[model samples]
Target: MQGGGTHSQWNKPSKPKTNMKHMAGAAAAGAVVGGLGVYMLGSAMSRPIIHFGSDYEDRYYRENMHRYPNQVYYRPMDEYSNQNNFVHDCVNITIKQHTVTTTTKGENFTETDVKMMERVVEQMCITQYERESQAYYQRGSS
Candidate 1:
């Protein structure tokens, strides 16, 4: 009876050792599978931005166009029609349209015209840029 008791203790420890080995293997496999799943999900989420191609910028800008006030100003006719920086270029375009003629003709712009055109561009730039920032303060309902 005493010899049997020692045998039982040895068997009990051996059973737990086998179970621990199996559990470690399962945990390793689970970790590998979980890591792969996370990597695949991250890759899929990042793909959309690149998938749309270069037109994405134009599309984004066009959609957000209403946020900017489009006070029409003739920019020195660009080879490209779209303004890179809308507010800045728009004001510059308008100012140029207002002054380009006199500057080109004979540099005969009067002091009053210079001040008037300067004020016009400054006001337009300040107000238009300020207006663009207003969208951040108020959420768009539409």
Candidate 2:
């Protein structure tokens, strides 16, 4: 009976040892995957700006002129026709256009012009990037 008990004890299962190496490897891989996921999520959340592509300048200028009519002004008349110079740093100058405008004569924009333009850009960026996410959340809730 004693011998049988000893044999049974030897056969009994014991707690398995922790595989530290495997655990570490899995943790490292998980960290990498998690980092990648975070990066992708951040990129998805970021607002999309109107980049200065080959045709963007011409398109922006024509569209702006059409939208606001003569309220918007551009100097260096020939420069406006050239797409390269038009889009590069024009946003900076556009930001100050109202400040530079003297009066409401021909097509001068007021301070409201600056505020409106800024607001439009901000709204556009937010709508472009977050609209789908907002929709997704709404769908999930419903």
Candidate 3:
């Protein structure tokens, strides 16, 4: 029995020693790399705009239709067309038909114009994009 106990003690596992200096070096390197990654990402996106291929934006607009707002519109006009950043960013310029008064009472009522244009675009959106995704969305064509 004494001999067996001595054999068991000899076979017992010992704790592995960790090199603190090596661990610290690894941690510093990891931190540096992580910070570099963050810096690179920030600089890449810093321009506030990156041309993500036109088709990608189109696909995004299609895939996530429920989130995108529908406000852009086109009206019948023979004379002129105008363009403007009618919304937040420079990229979202609301290109639209130029308006001219055929008569004093031709058109330009605010609420009615918005309503009619909304009706037109929703119908148009349903056709152009997936209606299933953009079912109950309207920004009242502005």
Candidate 4:
């Protein structure tokens, strides 16, 4: 008698084309879902609850004493002097509460010093809104 019985090998069925097709379909679906998710998130985040128009802009600019007729001025507080004589410059003063934010629109600010002006305006507007909310709460409580 033979020492061992004849052993049979089991081979996996060849389905390379089918497997590739399945993987491709899954990847395409995943891409579509991921793209849609990103788009939805962007739309949700970009929706502004309050929009600052020209009037708001004027008010914010004036309140911060950052208004300029033809140009915005920016300067370091230590270097700030009336004799600087630079027009259209916006000064960034050093203050404990000062925070800077920036957003780029359709136009790029390659040579404009006013690139960060909008962020300053937005900060002011947001601060005002918070103050108003506090005032409203106080009034309601009273």
Best by TM-score: 1
- Candidate 1 per-residue C-alpha lDDT over 9-120 given as tens digits, one digit per residue, 9 for 90 to 100: 2222223243334544544464453211110000001111111234644344333222222343422222344443644455455555556655665443455444445444
Clashing pairs in 3: none
- Comparing 2 and 3 on lDDT, the stronger one: 2
lDDT of 2 by residue, 5-77 (tens): 4453223343878665655444446445321111111222223334443464535433433333322222322
lDDT of 3 by residue, 73-141 (tens): 322222232422111111121112211121133433243333333333334333333332244355433
By lDDT, the candidates rank as 1, 2, 4, 3
lDDT tens digits, residue span 1-142, model 4: 7547787675545444533345445444644532111100000012122233566554543433242222222332233345322212222321111222222222222222233344443443334334544666889565
RMSD of each: 32.6, 29.0, 27.6, 25.6
| C-alpha-based local distance difference test score of model 3 | 0.29
Q: Which residue pairs show collisions in model 2?
A: none
Where is model 1 more than 4 Å wrong at Cα? 1-92, 101-108, 140-142
Q: Give the Cα lDDT of each candidate.
A: 0.40, 0.38, 0.29, 0.33
Over 4 Å off, model 4 = 1-65, 68-114
Per-candidate TM-scores read 0.30, 0.22, 0.20, 0.23
What does the lDDT read for residue 23 in candidate 1?
48
Worst 10 residues of 4 by lDDT: 36-45
Candidate 2 versus the native: TM-score?
0.22
In candidate 2, stretches whose alpha carbon ends up further than 4 angstroms from where it belongs are 1-106, 131-142
User: Which segments of model 3 are wrong by more than 4 Å?
Assistant: 1-95, 98-105, 131-142
How far out, in Å, is residue 53 in model 3? 42
